[PDB]
mmCIF file of C-alpha atoms in Angstrom:
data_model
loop_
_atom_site.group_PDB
_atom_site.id
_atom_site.type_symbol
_atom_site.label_atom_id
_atom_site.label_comp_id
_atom_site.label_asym_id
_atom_site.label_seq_id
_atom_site.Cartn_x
_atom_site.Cartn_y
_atom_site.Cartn_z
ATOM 1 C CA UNK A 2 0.000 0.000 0.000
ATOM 2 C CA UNK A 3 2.276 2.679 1.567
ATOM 3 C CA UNK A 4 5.277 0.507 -0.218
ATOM 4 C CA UNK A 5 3.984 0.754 -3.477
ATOM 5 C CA UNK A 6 3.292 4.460 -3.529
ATOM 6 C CA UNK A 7 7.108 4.650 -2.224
ATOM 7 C CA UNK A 8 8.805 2.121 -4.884
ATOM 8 C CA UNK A 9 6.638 3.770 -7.361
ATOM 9 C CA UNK A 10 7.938 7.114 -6.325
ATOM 10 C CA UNK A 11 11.493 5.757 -6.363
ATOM 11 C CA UNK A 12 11.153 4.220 -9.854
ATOM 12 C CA UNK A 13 9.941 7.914 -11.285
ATOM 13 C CA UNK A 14 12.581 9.605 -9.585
ATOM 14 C CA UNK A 15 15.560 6.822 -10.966
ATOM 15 C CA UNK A 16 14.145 7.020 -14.370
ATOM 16 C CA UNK A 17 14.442 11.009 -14.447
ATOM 17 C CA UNK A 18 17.624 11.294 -12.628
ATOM 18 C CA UNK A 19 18.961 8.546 -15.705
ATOM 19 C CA UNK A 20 17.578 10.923 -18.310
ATOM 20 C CA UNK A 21 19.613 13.739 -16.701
ATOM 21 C CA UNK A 22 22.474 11.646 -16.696
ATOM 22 C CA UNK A 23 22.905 11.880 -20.534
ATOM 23 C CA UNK A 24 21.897 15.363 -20.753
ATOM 24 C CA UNK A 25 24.244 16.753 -18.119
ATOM 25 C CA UNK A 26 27.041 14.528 -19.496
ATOM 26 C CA UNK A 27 26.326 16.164 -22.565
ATOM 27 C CA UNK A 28 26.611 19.623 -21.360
ATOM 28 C CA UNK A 29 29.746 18.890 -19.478
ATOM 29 C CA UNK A 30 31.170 17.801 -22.972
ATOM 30 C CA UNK A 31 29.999 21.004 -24.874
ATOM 31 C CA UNK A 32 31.229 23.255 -22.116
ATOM 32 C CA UNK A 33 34.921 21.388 -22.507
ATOM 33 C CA UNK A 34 34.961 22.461 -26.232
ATOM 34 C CA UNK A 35 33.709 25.689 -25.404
ATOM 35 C CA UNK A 36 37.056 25.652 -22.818
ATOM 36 C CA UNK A 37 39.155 24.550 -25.478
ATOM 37 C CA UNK A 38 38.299 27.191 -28.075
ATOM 38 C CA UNK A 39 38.831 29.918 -25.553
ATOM 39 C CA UNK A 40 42.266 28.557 -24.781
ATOM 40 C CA UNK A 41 42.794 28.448 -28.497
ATOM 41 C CA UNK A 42 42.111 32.045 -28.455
ATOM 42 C CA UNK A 43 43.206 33.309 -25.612
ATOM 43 C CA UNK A 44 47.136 32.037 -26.991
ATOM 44 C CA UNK A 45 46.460 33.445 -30.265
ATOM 45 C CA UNK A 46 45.561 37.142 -28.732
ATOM 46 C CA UNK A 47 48.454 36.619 -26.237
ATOM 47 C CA UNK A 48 51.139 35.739 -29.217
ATOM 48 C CA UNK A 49 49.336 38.353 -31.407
ATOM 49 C CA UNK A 50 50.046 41.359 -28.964
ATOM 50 C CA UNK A 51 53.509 40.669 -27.389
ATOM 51 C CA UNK B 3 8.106 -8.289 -6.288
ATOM 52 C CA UNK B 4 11.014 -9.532 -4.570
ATOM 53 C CA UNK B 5 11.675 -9.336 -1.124
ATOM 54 C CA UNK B 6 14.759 -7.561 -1.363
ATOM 55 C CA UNK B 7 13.654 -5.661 -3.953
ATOM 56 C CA UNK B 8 12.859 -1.940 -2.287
ATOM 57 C CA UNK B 9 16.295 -2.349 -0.738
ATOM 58 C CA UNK B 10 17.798 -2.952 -3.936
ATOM 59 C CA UNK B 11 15.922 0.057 -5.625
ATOM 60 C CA UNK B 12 16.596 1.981 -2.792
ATOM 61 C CA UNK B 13 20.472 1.728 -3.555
ATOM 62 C CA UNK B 14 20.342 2.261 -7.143
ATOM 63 C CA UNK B 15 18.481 5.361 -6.804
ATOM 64 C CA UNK B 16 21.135 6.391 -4.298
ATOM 65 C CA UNK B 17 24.151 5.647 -6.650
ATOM 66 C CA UNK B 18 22.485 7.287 -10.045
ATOM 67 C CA UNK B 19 21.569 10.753 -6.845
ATOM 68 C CA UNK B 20 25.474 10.057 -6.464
ATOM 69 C CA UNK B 21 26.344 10.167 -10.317
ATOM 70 C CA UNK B 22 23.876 12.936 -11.384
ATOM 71 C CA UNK B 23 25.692 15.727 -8.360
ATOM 72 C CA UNK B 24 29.151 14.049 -9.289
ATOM 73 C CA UNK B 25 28.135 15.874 -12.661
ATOM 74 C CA UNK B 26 26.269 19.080 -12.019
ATOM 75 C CA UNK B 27 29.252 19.878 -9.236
ATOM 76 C CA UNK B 28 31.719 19.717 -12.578
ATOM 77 C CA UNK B 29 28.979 21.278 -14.849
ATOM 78 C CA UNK B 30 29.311 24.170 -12.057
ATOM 79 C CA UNK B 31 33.124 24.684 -12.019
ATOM 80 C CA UNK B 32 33.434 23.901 -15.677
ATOM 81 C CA UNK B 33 31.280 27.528 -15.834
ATOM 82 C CA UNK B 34 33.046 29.208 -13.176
ATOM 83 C CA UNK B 35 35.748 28.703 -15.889
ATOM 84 C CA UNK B 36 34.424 30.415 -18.308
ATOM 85 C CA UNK B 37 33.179 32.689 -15.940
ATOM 86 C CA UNK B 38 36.467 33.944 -15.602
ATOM 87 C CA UNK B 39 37.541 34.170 -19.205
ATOM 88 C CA UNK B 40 34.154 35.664 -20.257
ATOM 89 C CA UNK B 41 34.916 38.563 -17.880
ATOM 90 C CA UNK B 42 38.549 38.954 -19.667
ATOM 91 C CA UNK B 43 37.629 38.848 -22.954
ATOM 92 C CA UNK B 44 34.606 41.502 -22.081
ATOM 93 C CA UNK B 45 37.420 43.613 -20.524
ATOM 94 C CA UNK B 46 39.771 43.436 -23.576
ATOM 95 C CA UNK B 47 36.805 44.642 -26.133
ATOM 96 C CA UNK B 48 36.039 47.359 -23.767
ATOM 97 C CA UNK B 49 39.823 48.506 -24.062
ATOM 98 C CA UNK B 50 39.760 47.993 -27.644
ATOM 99 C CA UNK B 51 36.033 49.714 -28.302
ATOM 100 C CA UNK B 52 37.095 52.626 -25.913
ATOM 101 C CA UNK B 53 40.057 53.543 -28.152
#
């Protein structure tokens, strides 16, 4: 009764938490290329003005 | 409907809560990053722009 309103609500929350899993592994990835292209610029505008 | 089957959910919903915050927590210093170069670059175009 009270254990199957409580694995049910555990089951929602696992699935969801999964689904952000992916996404927020995803993000994690874009932000790194987003890092690396900065870097990339960041040394050109350093060699470009000394 | 096993028997130790709310235990066992209750630990894999525990580990993916563990995996999901290992994530956000680098998520949040990954922009703290860029925090840092945005404001740089922002203060080199007002230099520039100014002149």
């Amino acid at each position: 009764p009270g254990s199957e309103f409580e694995f049910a609500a555990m089951t929602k929350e696992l699935n969801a938490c999964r689904e952000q899993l992916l996404e927020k592994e995803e993000e994690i990835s874009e932000l790194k290329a987003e890092r690396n292209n900065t870097r990339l610029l960041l040394e050109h505008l350093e060699a470009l003005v000394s």
